[PDB]
Design a protein around this nucleic acid. Structure first.
Ligand code: ATP
Ligand code: ATP
Ligand code: MG
Lengths: 463, 463, 87
DNA sequence: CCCCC
């Protein structure tokens, strides 16, 4: 009995509705997996696949009440969760899945085995996914204008290519990249090109994810990054002028983890999967509230140094020290990019870069030598080291150099340490930094009298 | 079988219901696309469209329960999403779409192709959309009073026309405009005229979008500009009297982007499409917290200099240097404008100006010479040149002026550079600006020594 | 489970305390990158909070919840690099 | 329930 129960069982036997570990209901319609808590996806699937059931079952599914009964039966039948979005080298489209390691495009049940629950939102066109075209030469000219193929720009260009290509691989990336440069240098053009290329896998959020508390309450600004392969933030302010909050290192470290806590309004799903490449456009370098060794492992910088100016302001730009090259501005390029002219050309370029930079494992490495905020830590980290045991047979040398021994621990006088620091970094130049380092790296032998359990590398080098 | 399903399929075959990429269901009623998130209009469409169905189908749609069944069927039928508001040269009305490029007015299925989800809110009158009328003469008299057709006011008048006409096109603009003048000069009259002309494509917000962070929590002030073609802000709080917040350059840069990040109350949507010309009525010049070249790329100024006064204060007005002309105030003009007397005359004028200023691509250009804040930067840009390869083969002569060579680069001492700068600008004028420039462009070979790699134009010119 | 330095350098109860609530049937709690006390101008870990953690039911509630009586079967492991200072 | 507070 229960024709409706039989219909629900038949639909469940097709493996077209699945329950995820988070609590979602993903359905397979029109050659793609979709989930949406606001749309009647299960009844949509029932109506869509009414054609694959017997003729006596097809006519029963034209009634919304009966479709809702079938949906209730299916919901009670789904008891086990599944693992979704586990292939980091598959790019999902609206009509199939592209193999990023092989170049094969799968449609239908071939693409169904990879439970890719997101998509670009548009259809793959193999007649445009071609190497040579009128659009490809123009796109290559644009890219070579933005990032010149010169010898002094080799490393920066390769880093730019790697960062752009990493927006295809759906895994957790462990760095935050900063597109730094002066005005009119191509950063927004690059952003728009990437958005056109990867479609719905691209999202843009606010600086609140960098300068606010992520726990909070309902946070759609974080909940909108679930499974996105690229996240953009833009327009960092100048932190030198007091009045702007600094970037939270806690947020920076929390954004590189495989899961991020944040939930929408009227929703109970708090944890989102992190597959994102986070890129920040800025005219100014970042300043963080607190600097430590971990934070320095998650920051990378790509610099833009080509100006596109109108003919009136070309001469003033040619004498600027923030530009290496000046080019003529193009006034139709924005519209051409907006109309998705270079979508498949840039997609092909990104796939080629993915192949080139995906030597067995692809990983993003930090560039801490570019951020001025990290210079004080980087310099002093190679000059002073903790107490020494194998250098214990040098206590006479330490005493002659000014150090003292206390429980076989090297201690330096505060005044002597200040005088030594003044040589490498002037007091007038970095008094706040030197005083903070003295107060932070030193232990308190008393309320007033204290000592630093850190000796200079050069002092120990002296025999 | 299933008359209701047949009705639903027939209605779906007319493409009168669409599902948008933001999750809305837009319906085609009364020659326009409409949607309401809090109260869907699909049943309204069913009732309205019942007249185009067979006679045996029209009678079933008089029952709300049957209409709801048909709506459920349609909702299950709608699977794919569509893109809306993609034509910038179409002006939507409540009964059709006006082709700005061509001049033809489309109604019916001709206006259906352009999925414009916004409208002016009033119907287009072809009889009032005429060049020869009693209203047009008065309107041109008013406009020539506000912005005279002299030779001194020619560029200002052209900028005025361009900014006013740019409120008809649905595309992202690159500049923010300031309507600057003294009191009783026609700025609010211009705002009211434009509001009367374009109806619901016009919005007015607060200064929070200029002086406050946009992401934060729910911000209806920034979320209400979605797809608006004109945004007005008024009455900047003069910043000389300390106690008023300054304008955020980060906000200025963010308001120019094609997408603005901000959400309403009880909404998960965090992106808004920027189609708006943003204008601010001011008695005072803007003051920004940080001034850089990226800010000086997005500011334009139109100045109003005609005074409309009561007969009593005419002489005290004529002895004022802020006015180039004094006329007689009209007391019925406010009511005449509020009664939509010049709506179609001003609309015709705006379309004519659109055609005039839409040489193939129309673009808003900055006017950085009208802001006194930018003067120091503009002068410094001309009074200095960055040392280059050509500067190297000049050291033997540059030593006469005190210039030195270090690291194969021509540089000058900090004290000498400070004295040279003081020789051009006094301390009391821009001491803070000079100090900020020195801090932001200083090259410190040692921690105690600082220098600038810039040369004065006079020394380079002299041989 | 792993939590930041909020549980140590802030109020354990406060308002919403997800960090405190995450120890609910969590046999191990980890803390990383502790704020060494040599710097002047930082908050302090509370001996009262230590005693509260030693109590057989530590104060802690989830968001929009009143079931603050969450049983404690947790041993906290705190990882740092500098000697702590207790007032 | 969010927002508000
Ligand atoms: N290769 C190119 N050749 C010619 N014109 C270009 C090229 N790339 C970009 N342009 C144009 O020159 C200008 C460059 O500004 P763009 O918005 O790309 O960068 P930006 O000012 O650094 O960005 P942001 O919005 O982050 O400040 C734009 O008007 C763009 O259309
Ligand atoms: N061409 C004109 N001829 C006669 N009267 C005019 C004309 N244009 C405007 N007026 C009237 O003169 C007055 C000027 O006020 P208006 O609102 O235009 O000034 P405003 O520049 O916005 O002033 P404020 O800066 O104080 O807001 C109004 O009463 C307006 O109706
Ligand atoms: Mg006014």
């Amino acid at each position: 009995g229960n024709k409706l129960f039989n219909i629900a069982q038949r639909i469940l036997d097709t493996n077209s509705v699945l329950l995820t570990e988070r609590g979602d209901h993903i359905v397979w319609i029109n050659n793609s997996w979709k989930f949406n808590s606001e749309e009647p996806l299960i009844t949509k699937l029932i109506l869509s696949i009414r054609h694959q059931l017997p003729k006596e079952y097809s006519s029963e599914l034209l009634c919304p009440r009966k479709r809702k009964t079938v949906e209730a039966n299916i919901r009670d039948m789904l008891v086990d969760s599944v693992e979704t979005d586990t292939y980091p080298d598959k790019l999902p489209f609206k009509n199939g899945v592209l193999d990023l390691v092989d170049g094969m495009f799968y449609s239908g049940d071939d693409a169904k085995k990879y439970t890719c629950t997101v998509s670009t939102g548009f259809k793959f066109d193999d007649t445009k996914f071609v190497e040579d075209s009128p659009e490809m030469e123009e796109l290559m000219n644009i890219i070579n204008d933005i990032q010149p193929l010169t010898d002094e720009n080799k490393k920066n260009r390769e880093l730019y290519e790697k960062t752009l290509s990493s927006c295809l691989c759906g895994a957790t990336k462990g760095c935050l990249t900063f597109f730094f440069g002066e005005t009119a240098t191509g950063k927004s053009t690059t952003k728009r090109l990437l958005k056109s290329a990867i479609g719905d896998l691209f999202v843009e959020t606010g600086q609140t994810i960098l300068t606010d508390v992520l726990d909070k309450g309902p946070n759609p600004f974080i909940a909108n990054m679930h499974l996105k392969r690229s996240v953009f933030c833009s327009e960092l302010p100048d932190f030198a002028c007091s009045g702007s909050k600094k970037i939270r290192s806690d947020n920076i470290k929390k954004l590189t983890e495989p899961c991020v806590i944040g939930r929408p309004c009227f929703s109970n799903k708090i944890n989102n999967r992190n597959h994102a490449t986070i890129i920040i456009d800025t005219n100014y370098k970042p300043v963080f509230d607190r600097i430590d060794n971990a934070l320095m492992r998650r920051i990378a910088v790509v610099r833009f140094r080509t100006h596109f100016s109108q003919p009136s302001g070309r001469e003033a730009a040619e004498n600027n020290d923030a530009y290496d090259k000046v080019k003529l501005l193009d006034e139709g390029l924005d519209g051409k990019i907006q109309n998705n002219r270079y979508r498949f050309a840039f997609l092909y370029l990104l796939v080629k870069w993915y192949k080139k930079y995906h030597i067995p494992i692809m990983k993003l490495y930090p560039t801490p030598e570019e951020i001025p905020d990290f210079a004080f830590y980087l310099k002093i980290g190679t000059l002073l080291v903790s107490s020494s045991v194998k250098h214990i047979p040098l206590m006479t040398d330490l005493s002659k150099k000014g150090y003292i021994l206390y429980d076989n621990v090297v201690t330096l006088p505060l005044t002597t340490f200040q005088q030594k620091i003044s040589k490498y970094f002037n007091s007038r130049l970095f008094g706040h930094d030197i005083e903070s380092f003295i107060n932070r790296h030193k232990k308190f032998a008393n309320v007033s009298d204290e000592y630093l359990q850190y000796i200079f590398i050069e002092d120990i080098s002296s025999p």
